[PDB]
Amino acid sequence: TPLVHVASVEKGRSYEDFQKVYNAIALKLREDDEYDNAIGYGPVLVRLAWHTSGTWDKHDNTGGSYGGTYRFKKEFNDPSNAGLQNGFKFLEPIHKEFPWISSGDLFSLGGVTAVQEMQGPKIPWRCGRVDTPEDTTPDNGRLPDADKDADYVRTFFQRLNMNDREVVALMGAHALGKTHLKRSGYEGPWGAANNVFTNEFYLNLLNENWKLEKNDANNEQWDSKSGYMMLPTDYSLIQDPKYLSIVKEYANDQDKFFKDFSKAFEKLLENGITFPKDAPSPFIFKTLEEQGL
Numbered sequence: 001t002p003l004v005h006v007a008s009v010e011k012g013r014s015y016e017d018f019q020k021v022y023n024a025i026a027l028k029l030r031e032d033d034e035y036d037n038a039i040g041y042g043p044v045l046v047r048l049a050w051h052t053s054g055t056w057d058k059h060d061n062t063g064g065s066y067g068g069t070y071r072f073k074k075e076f077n078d079p080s081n082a083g084l085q086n087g088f089k090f091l092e093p094i095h096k097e098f099p100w101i102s103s104g105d106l107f108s109l110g111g112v113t114a115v116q117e118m119q120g121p122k123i124p125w126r127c128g129r130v131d132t133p134e135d136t137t138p139d140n141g142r143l144p145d146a147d148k149d150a151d152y153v154r155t156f157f158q159r160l161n162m163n164d165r166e167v168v169a170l171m172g173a174h175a176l177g178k179t180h181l182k183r184s185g186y187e188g189p190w191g192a193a194n195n196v197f198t199n200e201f202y203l204n205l206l207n208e209n210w211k212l213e214k215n216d217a218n219n220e221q222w223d224s225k226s227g228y229m230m231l232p233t234d235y236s237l238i239q240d241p242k243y244l245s246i247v248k249e250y251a252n253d254q255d256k257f258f259k260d261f262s263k264a265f266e267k268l269l270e271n272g273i274t275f276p277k278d279a280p281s282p283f284i285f286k287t288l289e290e291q292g293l
């Protein structure tokens, strides 16, 4: 008997309230611009949204974004979550200013805000995640290993109810940020921009000259002469013929990648949540730039 998690709108809140939270996150992203050699907190916030959602299991509705369970020791100490404390620390003053927003709503909204502020697609977002108790925290080990092949990636993502297109689209988030040796045992950025959301991940996969090397942690990763890297799981997207077709598609159509990423990312963030028939429609937040702020 899977759990049922029903979205419940924070009492009396509407679009304007959530746009204010978005704005606070966005303003702080602009302000705190030295973090991680001037990449800023955008990428780590996207990773935090993904890891807080990616614990979901479709079979029994355990894990997922709803409960905001990353706030609990077992989950924030997950080896898979190493470094995400930076995203959590970033969000702390946001939580303090807006203590009415649920933890799940805040983690997921952090990811949406980061993507949009980094010039990515609009990501419609729905409120109503409700904090669940410590004993609802999923055990460690539900997040994916990076040292694996296409078969692993495909099978892994079936648990999150993602198909090939959704997987390939979601992986394009690797345009953002970088791997850090001390966090994950991998080192280097996937591309040049780091804090601009584009289809660069796919272009780099297809266009760079990759060499399978060992990093300083004795793990294999694919390295280019440009100083970029790909995880074995990234590289598997061009080894598998079905993934490869989709990589080529996104490398050659920026708009299509944006549309597909937006759908898959919202889906990821909403997995496991039952929205009542009379729940508000998804919100689409204006960027700071769109507001002249």
Ligand code: HEM
Pocket: 043, 044, 046, 047, 050, 083, 144, 145, 146, 147, 153, 170, 171, 173, 174, 176, 177, 178, 179, 180, 181, 183, 184, 185, 186, 231, 233, 265
């Ligand atoms: C097979 C699936 C995936 C694997 C194995 C994987 C693995 C990793 C690893 C090892 C890192 C480096 C962590 C570090 O050293 O800081 C990383 C970073 C990152 N991941 Fe993925 N990931 C996967 C899918 C995703 C998805 C679906 C998203 C979001 C849509 C995502 C977003 C990010 C972002 C933005 C970073 C950079 C974080 C930063 O710069 O602080 N990843 N991932």
Ligand SMILES: COc1ccccc1O
Pocket: 029, 030, 032, 033, 034, 038, 039, 040, 041, 042, 043, 114, 117, 118, 195
């Ligand atoms: C300076 O870093 C950022 C600014 C706005 C959005 C995301 C970032 O990483």
Ligand SMILES: COc1ccccc1O
Pocket: 071, 088, 091, 092, 093, 095, 096, 102, 103, 106, 107
């Ligand atoms: C419950 O406190 C938090 C939740 C989500 C993000 C930052 C926080 O301080």
